[PDB]
Structure 1
Amino acid sequence: VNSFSGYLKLTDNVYIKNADIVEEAKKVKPTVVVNAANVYLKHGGGVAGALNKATNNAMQVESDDYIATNGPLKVGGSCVLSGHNLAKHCLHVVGPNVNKGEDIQLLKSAYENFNQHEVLLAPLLSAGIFGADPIHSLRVCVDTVRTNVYLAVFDKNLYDKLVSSFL
């Protein structure tokens, strides 16, 4: 039993809720919150900009030190950093950005990072300003992630479309 409340169960291991991932992170304090990162960990907008704002820019400061030491991530890759005031850890995962021409097949590789964590609060990878179809992203999530994932979908209309179209 965990403290995530009000989720609809999609499969054995995937749950979904119309929620602001920032507010959900502040209330649950999960072990892992997933960020929709880019390879430079420049948290300007979308989920990343919101999570970073909620940390008063501490996420960005930590991220800049990480990049200065290690260089950029790979598209499809990830790193574990602090969750600051939102979670124990933040798993920064880089899904492909369609608005940069990146290969959508890398979306499965991106979701594979979730399997290294038993439970996660996460957004749909490559959705929103990353330009992928969120229905496709949800399908890849369900078919790739085997650990327990709680998906927060900010947009109520997108949320009900995701639920109503889910196979």
Structure 2
Amino acid sequence: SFSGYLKLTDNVYIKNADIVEEAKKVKPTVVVNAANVYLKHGGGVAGALNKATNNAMQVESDDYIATNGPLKVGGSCVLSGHNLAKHCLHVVGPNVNKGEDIQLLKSAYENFNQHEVLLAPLLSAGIFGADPIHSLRVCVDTVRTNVYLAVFDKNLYDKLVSSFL
């Protein structure tokens, strides 16, 4: 199962790891993607997960959007996990750089509650522009299922652990 994680709460765990390498190693039931409403996996976690699938995630995602239209900010969809996981839960956190409501971050984390265990990044962190400390706080106060957070940046990981209330 998951190894090397620091336990933050009863159900939240955290590790300084590349989520792509972590997914290839564990092959979890669910890997969370930091998706946008269009499922255009260009950069950040989405670009990295998509590149690891040899673009199969993007091909599947374009068919999903052609059939269903865009997701809502705060929403999600379950697609294949390809070579990384059984499923990928594409979750749209608000992008502060796009002027999206940070209050939608709790709605985005609520999607995790539909899955017993997930490998995930911090929603709205990185290129989405939100404060990762705030994202971790919303995660622990919203997610009740078992979440294993992978934080790519060592310096941010140390700051998140050392400042965790």
Q: Distance in 2 between matches of 1:10 and 1:150?
A: 10
Aligned length: 165
* SS of equivalent residue, structure 1 residue 68: helix
Tell me by how many angstroms 1:41 deviates: 0.1
SS at match of 1:138: helix
What is the rounded CA distance, in whole Å, between the counterparts of 2:103 and 2:138 in structure 1? 10
Between the aligned partners of 1:5 and 1:120, the Cα distance in structure 2 is: 14
Secondary structure, aligned partner of 2:136: helix
- The 2-side partners of 1:116 and 1:34 are apart by 12
Question: Residue 89 of structure 2: SS of its match in structure 1?
Answer: strand
Unaligned runs of 5+ residues in structure 1 are: none
Whole-Å Cα distance in 2 between the matches of residues 151 and 11 of structure 1?
12
**1:106-154 Cα shifts (integer Å, max 9, x gaps):** 0000000000000000000000000000000000000000000000000
CA distance in 2, matches of 1:105, 1:15: 23
- In 2, Cα distance between equivalents of 1:87 and 1:137: 23
C-alpha separation in 2, matches of 1:85 and 1:55: 6
Q: Does 1:138 align with 2:133?
A: no
TM-score w.r.t. length of structure 2: 1.00
Paired residue secondary structure (2:155):
helix
Measured in 2, the distance between the counterparts of 1:112 and 1:105 equals: 12
Query: How big is the shift at 1:8?
Result: 0.1
Give structure 1 regions of 4+ aligned residues with deviation exceeding 6 angstroms: none
Q: Percent identity?
A: 100
RMSD of aligned C-alpha atoms? 0.1
Deviation at 1:156, TM superposition (A): 0.1
Q: Any unmatched runs of 5+ in structure 2?
A: none
SS in 2 for 1:141: helix
**Distance in 2 between residues matched to 1:113 and 1:125, nearest whole Å:** 11
Deviations 1:50-85 (A, max 9, x none): 000000000000000000000000000000000000
Instruction: Give 1:102 deviation, angstroms.
Output: 0.2
